[PDB]
Structure formats: C-alpha cells, structure tokens
C-alpha cells in the first residue's frame, strides 16, 4: 500500500493529511529523531522563586509543533531540574504537558507510528533553596547524510575520524603517526638510532598503506641533548630513507614532530 | 533523640556534630587545616539540612600544641566560612567543642 499526502484530492476526500503524517514529514525535513527537539525562545523565560515561566517558546518534539505562552513550570529546590515536554496523543484536549524531573527521562517513544507518551527533555534549570541559579538548554541535534555547503562557521568543535600507527622503522627509530580526516598526519619520533648511513633505507617496517603519502615527505627530527638534527623521507611506497649524517654503533635519542598531507590537489 | 553527622568541610577540617532534641548541637573539631584564607568558604562538603542553624553560628576552635585559635561560621545555607588567619601548605591540627541552637524563638 502507498499512502499519499502532498497530492491533489480530486474529490476533496482522497488524501487527508493526518497530524502524525505531518509529524513524520517535519522530522524528516529537519533531520530530527524522537530524542531531540527544535526549540526557540522568542522572548526570554522568566524566573520567579522556584518557577520558570516560558513567556514565548516554540518547541518541535516528534515533529509536533506547539507554543509555550506564559506557561509556568514549578521546580524542586536545591536541585538540577530536567524540564520535559510530554506528549500524550490520547489526551485529545491537552496532548502536551511540561514536567520538572530529577533526571533526563527522555524516552524516544515513536508517537507518530505507535502508542505511548513521548517524553523529551529540552531545558536544565538549577535551583537554590529560593530560586533559579542557572539554566542550560538541551542540544538540538540535526542528523544529516551527505552535505554540500559553500561556507561554514563552527563555534564549538568539529569531530573528524582519527587513526593511529606505530612504526618500528628500523635501526632503533620509532614513528608514532596520527592521521585526522584521512589526510593530515603528525609524526612523533621516538627511540634511538644507530648503524645507519645517509641515503640508506631503514632496516625495519615500512609505513602501512593508509598512512602513505601521494608524494615523498621529508620530516625533520632532532637528537636529544644535542645541537644536531636529521631528516627522514617517507616515500609513497611506504619505505623510509635516512637523511641524517652517518650514525655509528652508539644509539642517539631521536625526537620531534613533523606533519604531512596524504592527499594532493583534486 | 540524638542525631550525628561527620562533615569533611574541606581543607583538612572535619566536624563531628551531635544534635540532641533536634535543637542543641555540639560540634567537635578534628583533622588539620591547610591552604585557606580568612573569609574564604571551605572547599568541601556543606552541612546537611537537618544540622543547619536558623542564624549564622561562629564556632571557636584551637590549634593543638599552640597558643593560637580560629573560628568558623556555619551559615544557614549550609556553607562553612573560615575565620582564622591565613593557613599555608603545612596543616595544623584543629580541635575544640562549640555549641549552637538550630531553632530560634518561634
């Protein structure tokens, strides 16, 4: 069966739009699940003793839009109050109610497909014995798939994938590689090098394919407690070439951070 | 009836409170205080509601083996304010009995 909504009803009866159908539509347009909200304080809520008056706040919960117009919720003293919007569709006259609770009791109940009361926390109000000391809103989550954007401004942080690899390069040299967004790599040198000549390939493990650069990368390192330095080349094939001076039998501690890009242009 | 409470007030100070008839409290000081300044709220646990007085109570204490003293204020809100001199990194043993009434005339 296919149930159509955003279509012409030839005889004005074919496709009526039910509130749960619009609920699902709206959830899909904004990219929200049953565990988040859309919320906007058009005017500031007002705190009076152990109460919060929502003067003009709009909320979308489970794709259902409602407005809090001079709606006061009573609070517990000396407590962290979790303010919830509770939707009970069977309460035909008043489906929505607000509650102040001791914990975040958001239940993710699918009210558009099934039975039950949807509870979703949208505000955290901390009190003293006499009134409100602080308020923190619950985050509004947008769950998206693939985004094409021109410009973006981030006020908090971007979390990208991170991969790590330790390479026993040979001759006592160790590399600890950290790759972020599958592109930027920071190499940290460890260990102590001995028995190597300039231009010689190091005697150990080659860099794993996921960390290999598209072009040769020369990474500068330093000898601990000395005024001397070295460099190594991480070749596109994964091999590592020594480009410091010749090192004898006595190991010298190797340290330092070097960065490279795995990906080139295009 | 008798109720007891141990408060780790912070900065190494420990209060052992005994309340009788739900009114008269005797505070016994224990522990050793360090890293505190005059007028500063102590860094630990506040006094539980059943032991909080209606009005601020200043309780005199003594530094063991010294001729020096201190006082703390148990505030109606449960907080404890240090009113001795500034204390450095070296803790000095704090002792003494102080009494207060929870209830005023009502």
């Amino acid at each position: 069966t296919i149930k159509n909504f955003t279509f012409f009803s030839p005889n004005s009866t074919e496709f009526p739009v039910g509130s749960n159908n619009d609920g699902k539509l709206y959830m899909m347009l904004t990219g929200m699940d049953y565990r988040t909200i859309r919320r906007k304080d058009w005017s500031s809520p007002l705190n009076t003793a152990l109460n919060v008056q929502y003067t003009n706040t709009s909320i979308i919960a489970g794709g259902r839009y409602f407005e809090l117009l001079n709606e006061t919720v009573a609070l517990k003293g000396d407590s962290v109050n979790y303010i919830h919007a509770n939707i009970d569709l069977t309460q035909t006259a008043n489906p929505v109610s607000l509650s102040a609770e001791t914990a975040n009791n958001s239940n993710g109940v699918d009210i558009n497909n099934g039975s039950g009361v949807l509870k979703v926390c949208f505000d955290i109000v901390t009190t003293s014995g006499t009134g409100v000391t602080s308020t923190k809103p619950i985050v509004q989550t947008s769950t998206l798939d693939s985004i094409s954007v021109n410009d973006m401004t981030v006020s908090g942080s971007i979390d990208v994938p991170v991969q790590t690899l330790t390479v026993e390069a040979g001759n006592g040299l160790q590399l600890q590689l950290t790759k972020k967004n599958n592109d930027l790599v920071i190499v940290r040198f460890f260990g102590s090098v001995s028995n190597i000549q300039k231009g010689w390939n190091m005697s150990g493990t080659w860099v794993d394919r996921p960390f290999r650069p598209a072009a040769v990368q020369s990474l500068v390192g330093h000898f601990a407690g000395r005024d001397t330095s070295f460099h190594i080349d991480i070749n596109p094939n994964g091999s590592i070439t020594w480009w410091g001076a010749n090192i004898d039998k006595t190991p010298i501690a190797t340290r330092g951070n070097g960065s490279y890009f795995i990906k080139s242009a295009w | 009836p008798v109720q007891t409470l141990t408060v780790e007030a912070g900065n190494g100070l420990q209060l052992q409170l005994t309340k009788k008839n739900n009114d008269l409290v005797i505070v016994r000081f224990f522990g050793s205080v360090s890293n505190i300044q005059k007028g500063w709220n102590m860094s630990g646990t506040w006094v539980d509601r059943p032991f909080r007085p209606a009005a601020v109570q200043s309780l005199v204490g003594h530094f063991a083996g010294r001729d020096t003293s201190f006082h703390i204020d148990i505030n109606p809100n449960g907080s404890i304010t240090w009113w001795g001199a500034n204390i450095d990194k070296t803790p000095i043993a704090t002792r003494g009995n102080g009494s207060y009434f929870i209830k005023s005339a009502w």
Partner: nanobody
Amino acid sequence: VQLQESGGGLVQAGGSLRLSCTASRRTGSNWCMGWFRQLAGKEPELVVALNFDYDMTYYADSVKGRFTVSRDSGKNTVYLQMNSLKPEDTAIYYCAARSGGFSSNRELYDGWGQGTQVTVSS
C-alpha cells in the same frame, strides 16, 4: 538575586576609573559582593570582594594597592575605585555576589551579572 552594573568604559593607561554594582537581595550570612575578571579570552577569576557582615576585603596580589572596594550605607551597593590603570587590566568585569564568604568557584555565587567591559587605552 538580580544585578545592576553601572559605570565603566574608556580611559588612558596610568589613569583612574570606577565601577558600581547593586544586588536586589542578600541570600544570607557572610554576604560577599565583588567582581570576577576575564583577560584575553582566559578563564574568569575573582579579583575584588567585600565581606559585608565582617567589613573585610579581598584583593588579588596583582591589583593590591591599586584598587579600592567601598560600600554605600545599607543599600547593598559596592564600588570599585580603579586608579593607576594598566593595559593588562583590559578585561570584562562581571559582578558576583554570594552567601558563605569568598570563593574561586563560579557556581558557588548566588548572583552573577551581565559584565561591563574595561578598555585601558595605550
């Protein structure tokens, strides 16, 4: 527990300026009224505070002998007379008030203000 933050603006280095703050009510005993400083995007820190019940002041070592905190009658109003100003002193000065004495912790303060911006010109 509402706060008013009168006074504050622009002045030259080595000069003088003032700050005013009034609290709607006092939350209890050991009533402390003062100011938290926030320089170059760093963490906010208490710099000037007055214990009303004890008439005892606290000044951070960095501002000692330069700043003076005063009280006006029983109006629950605090003033900061800032003399011999420095470029480092350019920060956002929020008004803080609480019952229980002086504290480094933000949360322990019953009253927190908007924050008046201090700009020490060079």
